[PDB]
Amino acid sequence: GGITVLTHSELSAEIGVTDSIVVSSELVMPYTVGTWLRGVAANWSKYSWLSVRYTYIPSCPSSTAGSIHMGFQYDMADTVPVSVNQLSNLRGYVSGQVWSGSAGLCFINGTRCSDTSTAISTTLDVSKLGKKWYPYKTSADYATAVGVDVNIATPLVPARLVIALLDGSSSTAVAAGRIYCTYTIQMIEPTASALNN
């Protein structure tokens, strides 16, 4: 009672596949997970992750050279991996060919999952996060805060998803796949949409 529990699955990020190891990162918070949730979660001041799961889903030919990597960092102050190696250490390291993972599909439509060993997907260890409840922060205000000092962020966001997309066959981008997020969340302490930062 009091809370509100949404459980959904939307595209979290489109992936381009190249040959020069490009390394990105997304905060594991509502405003960043995806457009849809970003829209809802706003109506609630704080929230708590219950089950966060990013899953890669291909959309390219089998003749598409390339591998993708995912992992998690938690002390926002830490330096985002420079080498994919450094990345393979993080919690929940995972990596497969940018055209495989077809099987992970059963995480997005919420169907009965058969064998998920071939699925390029990792989860968030919710039990080991700083706070139980976090404040809904807008990318804007967040940046402004990390501008003064990054550490002021450790209490605004639970973790960060480190993504690496190396190995390709061309110097320019080639559409490869998408990373959808399948989360279960508890939204609380409602608020006017435009009053959230």
Instruction: Number of residues interacting with a copy of itself: please give it, by CB under 8 A.
Output: 102
Q: How many CB atoms lie within 10 A of CB 37?
A: 23
Q: Does 196 help bind Ca ion (rule: CB under 5 A)?
A: yes
Cα 50 to Cα 68: distance, rounded to the nearest angstrom: 26
**Is 196 annotated among the ligand-binding residues?**
yes
Site for a copy of itself in 30-49 (CB under 8 A): 35-36, 38-40, 42-43, 45-46
Which amino acid would we find at residue 14? Answer: E
Q: Are 47 and 187 in contact (CB under 8 A)?
A: yes
Binding partner at 114 among a copy of itself, Ca ion, none, C-beta below 5 to 8 Å by kind = none
Site for a copy of itself in 56-85 (CB under 8 A): 59-67, 72-75, 77-85
The pattern of x and - marking residues 144 through 173 that bind a copy of itself according to CB under 8 A reads xx--xxxxx-xxx---------xxxx---x
H or E element that contains 44: strand 44-51
Cα 92 to Cα 158: distance, rounded to the nearest angstrom: 15
**Is 136 annotated among the ligand-binding residues?**
yes
Shortest distance in whole angstroms from residue 83 CB to Ca ion? 18
The phi-psi region of residue 76 (left if phi > 0; otherwise alpha if psi is between -120 and 50; otherwise beta) is: alpha
Known binding-site residues equal 75, 78, 136, 196-197
